[PDB]
Amino acid sequence: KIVNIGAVLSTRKHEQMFREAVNQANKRHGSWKIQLNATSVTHKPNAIQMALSVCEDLISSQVYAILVSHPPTPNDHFTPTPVSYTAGFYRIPVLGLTTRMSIYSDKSIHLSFLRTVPPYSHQSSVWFEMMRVYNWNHIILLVSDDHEGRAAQKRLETLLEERESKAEKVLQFDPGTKNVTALLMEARELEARVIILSASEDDAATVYRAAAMLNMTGSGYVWLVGEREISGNALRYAPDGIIGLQLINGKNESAHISDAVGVVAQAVHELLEKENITDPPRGCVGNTNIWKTGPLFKRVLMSSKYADGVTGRVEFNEDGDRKFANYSIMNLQNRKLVQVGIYNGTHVIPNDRKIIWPGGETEKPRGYQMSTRLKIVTIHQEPFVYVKPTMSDGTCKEEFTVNGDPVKKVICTGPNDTSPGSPRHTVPQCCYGFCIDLLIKLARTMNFTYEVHLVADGKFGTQERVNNSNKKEWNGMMGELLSGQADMIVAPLTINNERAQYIEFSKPFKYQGLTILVKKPEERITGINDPRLRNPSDKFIYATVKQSSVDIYFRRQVELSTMYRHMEKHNYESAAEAIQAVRDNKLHAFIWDSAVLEFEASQKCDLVTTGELFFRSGFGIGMRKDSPWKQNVSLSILKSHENGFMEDLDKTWVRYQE
Amino acid sequence: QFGASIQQQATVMLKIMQDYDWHVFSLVTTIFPGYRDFISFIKTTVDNSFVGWDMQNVITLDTSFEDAKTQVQLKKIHSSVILLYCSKDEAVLILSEARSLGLTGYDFFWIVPSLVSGNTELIPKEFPSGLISVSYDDWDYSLE
Amino acid sequence: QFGASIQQQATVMLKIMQDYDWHVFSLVTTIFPGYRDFISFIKTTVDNSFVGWDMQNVITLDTSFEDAKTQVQLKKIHSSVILLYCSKDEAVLILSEARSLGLTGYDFFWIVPSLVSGNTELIPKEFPSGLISVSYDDWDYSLE
């Protein structure tokens, strides 16, 4: 007829308040014959013998609830873990009250741990409420604590599942280092300014000093931190105008103890109304039998619904967290904490105080500034991308064409040869041609600067297994684009269904098919329907560029596996290698686009194309995902389609013959 | 520890599914903890495998099933291979509902991990004869 | 008596299906008597039609359903038009089971005979709004 409650509490005044709450718990519950005893223990500066003393004292006491209520501990470990593990050996609920670590959220590790405080990842949902208010989509994540970093990434993907957007940059590294400013500058070069930080006080002060020295706290830079990042020297190193969070009664222990007493008391009076009552045995000596109503009492604690307390509607979810939590939103106005918002369990309301930002006006700074210098990457296409070495030092010889058109070149940067050939030789040379004039037309239509560089290899990019952990990766232009080093691929991109699933496409500027390059008895082949090419031999030598989209289009064709097995022994690096090889009469056929070989037939009369025209497709501009550089650029491309500028580009290279 | 984690075990089970061309499957996840890592590992493995897995959407749970809202999600199942991540006392009720809904047919498969399959002696009669399990408990190599 | 028969009503319902080109359908028959003549009349009508109907196999019920073996035949239903022949008492359970299955969709039509369509006043809440029925109940021509 007795119920024992164990507690690890230090101060005698709060012990007296705890005993007073135990005494007042039996007030409104009638004259029932249940009794409530409480046993509180102090704290030795160690942790092993503390765990020993507490575990054998609570075995000898046979308690039902175990409480740890020590915020101001000098050790920064904050580990009530061993007593919770010892109670989880017999499945006894330990109600943690102080820490908010995400390692306690794993119920597979902490089998019988409950708590009335949520982890900080729920604050990101509050920050998602910022996304419900300030209408901001692209974020920049920075988490140093990797024990909670996977849970923060999980919660972030759970929040972004609704809008189906993507985080622009995520970062995880070892806490303790200092040279993280390179990734800060890489995030600075991005369009967004939203900064989400999840670390301890030392790394927060380190990144505050790094933003202060590099002036990343100017206009438009969105800063959004929590309670751990506004304490200690991080509060001293914080810039003025930063927005932070505050836990209402997060450190106020006296009402929190009474709330915990009310929760435990109503849980015990709920459990007394049901059958199958079991008791914890004397597990110190000769008792390893588990307490059989562990998950039963846990299920009692799952449906615990309350209506008493100064905090309010305390309620457990499936994770045993805190529902309907009042939060405060603070601002740092001239090294002074100024309250600028309140938060109920679903909605943010700013108070009568104004919101003064570190940049300009008091309204929200739209920190989504698009890149005025679009990084352009391309492959060396032979009739389209002419690359010429410089004359004296980084210069371009301004030669004139035969039609009175001056060639407007650009200073591009490119490697010299392949990686076994050239170890490291990347020089700036002169790029011009077809798509360069297309980019000149785009820069004439819309005012934006650019940065033309070249892809490191001579491949488009295929979907290949990386050599560890069985993961798909891309390479080439797609590998340089998806890594964030490139912005817009201006190249004759072969449009297919696979790449449409991953990135968005624009309107095609080129429209052509496929053809066969031969040299001039049947000297022609007339397409794929030659039966000798269905079952080839060592005579008809035909191949294509290694890691090309033509090979992917043939890989989708499940009835031409013989050509896929035949052409893999003769794939070349570039198409010019195939031109030189068939120039020496070593090749016999080559599947390639139409107008390139038409221009090369206009250059060299021995180069002969075939008669058929299959795979009538289009080539456009390689693009990113949903972006404001899509609609206006596509309208500019269609404006180039409707006028005679396509005919002008034909007059430059296509219509011009010899 | 000298053991085998659930991630490498999921890798082995998806290797089994790749070696059998069992590409049309489903996934039922309960409220047993350590489950979102399992879902995310399945998502990354499907995104990093040459199969292109035809995966039905995840049947999620909230509590012990009322057989009112979980019934609709279980009646969405029409695929053969069924994956599950739960405890044993949950799996008894899951297999009882699956036999009650007829999900234990000859076409339908059931692959469970080693954490739900406990003692070799304690086998309740509600288990389907043909239940696929993967455990590192090798009787050929003793403790010595 | 007057009016049509169940065979002429089946002819009218197949004329409805012919006028709308709903050629992919099914047939679900319960243990209400006169059912083998109904199935044989449908077979001879498909065999005497200019359509070339796509008829799924007949789902035959046995007793009050355990929702174990009948659900296997109900999950085989991939067609659009569902043809049900039963009484008024079993129709509530069949429509509730089909709603639990999710087989009461927008493309999943329901055409019922006249005898299951009972009282105009007594309408249970398990009827889909759009339930197709055929009966000789004409209000424009009275008894006189």
Curated annotation (Swiss-Prot), chain A:
* Record text on activity regulation: NMDA glutamate receptor activity is potentiated by Zn2(+) in a dose-dependent fashion. The potentiating effect of Zn2(+) is at submicromolar concentrations and its inhibitory action is at high micromolar to millimolar concentrations. Excitatory glycine receptors are inhibited by D-serine at 100uM.
Specify first residue, last residue and whole-protein length for the fragment.
Answer: 25 to 797 of 938
- Read off the domain note: A hydrophobic region that gives rise to the prediction of a transmembrane span does not cross the membrane, but is part of a discontinuously helical region that dips into the membrane and is probably part of the pore and of the selectivity filter. The extracellular N-terminal domain (ATD) is a site of allosteric regulation to modulate overall receptor function.
Instruction: Tell me the GO BP annotations in alphabetical order.
Output: adult locomotory behavior; associative learning; calcium ion homeostasis; calcium ion transmembrane import into cytosol; calcium ion transmembrane transport; calcium ion transport; cellular response to glycine; cellular response to manganese ion
Q: How does it sit in the membrane?
A: Multi-pass membrane protein
What binding partners and quaternary form does the record give?
A: Heterotetramer; the NMDAR subunits are modular and harbor tiered domains that function in concert to regulate opening and closing of the cation-selective ion channel pore. Forms heterotetrameric channels composed of two GluN1/zeta subunits (GRIN1), and two identical GluN2/epsilon subunits (GRIN2A, GRIN2B, GRIN2C or GRIN2D) or GluN3 subunits (GRIN3A or GRIN3B) (in vitro). Can also form heterotetrameric channels that contain at least two GluN1 subunits and at least two different GluN2 subunits (or a combination of one GluN2 and one GluN3 subunits) (in vitro).
> Keywords in UniProt for this one?
Calcium, Cell membrane, Disulfide bond, Glycoprotein, Ion channel, Ion transport, Ligand-gated ion channel, Magnesium, Membrane, Metal-binding, Phosphoprotein, Postsynaptic cell membrane, Receptor, Signal, Synapse, Transmembrane, Transmembrane helix, Transport, Zinc
Functional summary from the UniProt entry:
Component of N-methyl-D-aspartate (NMDA) receptors (NMDARs) that function as heterotetrameric, ligand-gated cation channels with high calcium permeability and voltage-dependent block by Mg(2+). NMDARs participate in synaptic plasticity for learning and memory formation by contributing to the long-term potentiation (LTP). Channel activation requires binding of the neurotransmitter L-glutamate to the GluN2 subunit, glycine or D-serine binding to the GluN1 subunit, plus membrane depolarization to eliminate channel inhibition by Mg(2+).
Q: Where in the cell is it found?
A: Cell membrane; Postsynaptic cell membrane; Synaptic cell membrane; Postsynaptic density membrane
Entry's family note: Belongs to the glutamate-gated ion channel (TC 1.A.10.1) family. NR1/GRIN1 subfamily.
Swiss-Prot record, chains B, C:
| Residue sites binding Zn(2+) per the record | E121, D137
Q: Where expressed (tissue)?
A: Detected in brain cortex, olfactory bulb, hippocampus including the dentate gyrus, striatum, thalamus, superior colliculus, inferior colliculus, midbrain and cerebellum (at protein level). Detected in brain cortex, hypothalamus and cerebellum.
Cellular location of this protein? Cell projection, Dendritic spine; Cell membrane; Synapse; Postsynaptic cell membrane
Entry remark concerning the domains of this protein: Contains an N-terminal domain, a ligand-binding domain and a transmembrane domain. Agonist binding to the extracellular ligand-binding domains triggers channel gating.
Q: How does it assemble?
A: Heterotetramer. Forms heterotetrameric channels composed of two GluN1/zeta subunits (GRIN1), and two identical GluN2/epsilon subunits (GRIN2A, GRIN2B, GRIN2C or GRIN2D) or GluN3 subunits (GRIN3A or GRIN3B) (in vitro). Can also form heterotetrameric channels that contain at least two GluN1 subunits and at least two different GluN2 subunits (or a combination of one GluN2 and one GluN3 subunits) (in vitro). In vivo, the subunit composition may depend on the expression levels of the different subunits. Found in a complex with GRIN1, GRIN3A and PPP2CB. Found in a complex with GRIN1 and GRIN3B.
Annotated function: Component of N-methyl-D-aspartate (NMDA) receptors (NMDARs) that function as heterotetrameric, ligand-gated cation channels with high calcium permeability and voltage-dependent block by Mg(2+). NMDARs participate in synaptic plasticity for learning and memory formation by contributing to the slow phase of excitatory postsynaptic current, long-term synaptic potentiation, and learning.
Family, according to the entry, reads as follows: Belongs to the glutamate-gated ion channel (TC 1.A.10.1) family. NR2A/GRIN2A subfamily.
Would you tell me the protein name for this molecule? Glutamate receptor ionotropic, NMDA 2A
Gene from which this protein is expressed: Grin2a
Q: Which part of the complete protein is shown?
A: 146 to 289 of 1464
